[PDB]
JSON list of C-alpha atoms in Angstrom, two decimals:
[
{"chain": "A", "resi": 12, "resn": "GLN", "atom": "CA", "xyz": [154.84, -16.57, 56.71]},
{"chain": "A", "resi": 13, "resn": "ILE", "atom": "CA", "xyz": [154.91, -13.00, 55.33]},
{"chain": "A", "resi": 14, "resn": "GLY", "atom": "CA", "xyz": [152.97, -11.70, 52.32]},
{"chain": "A", "resi": 15, "resn": "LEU", "atom": "CA", "xyz": [153.62, -8.11, 51.20]},
{"chain": "A", "resi": 16, "resn": "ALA", "atom": "CA", "xyz": [151.88, -6.55, 48.18]},
{"chain": "A", "resi": 17, "resn": "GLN", "atom": "CA", "xyz": [152.31, -2.93, 47.03]},
{"chain": "A", "resi": 18, "resn": "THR", "atom": "CA", "xyz": [150.86, -0.94, 44.12]},
{"chain": "A", "resi": 19, "resn": "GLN", "atom": "CA", "xyz": [151.13, 2.69, 43.02]}
]
């Protein structure tokens, strides 16, 4: 289980 969230 991997959750990866990115914002710029």
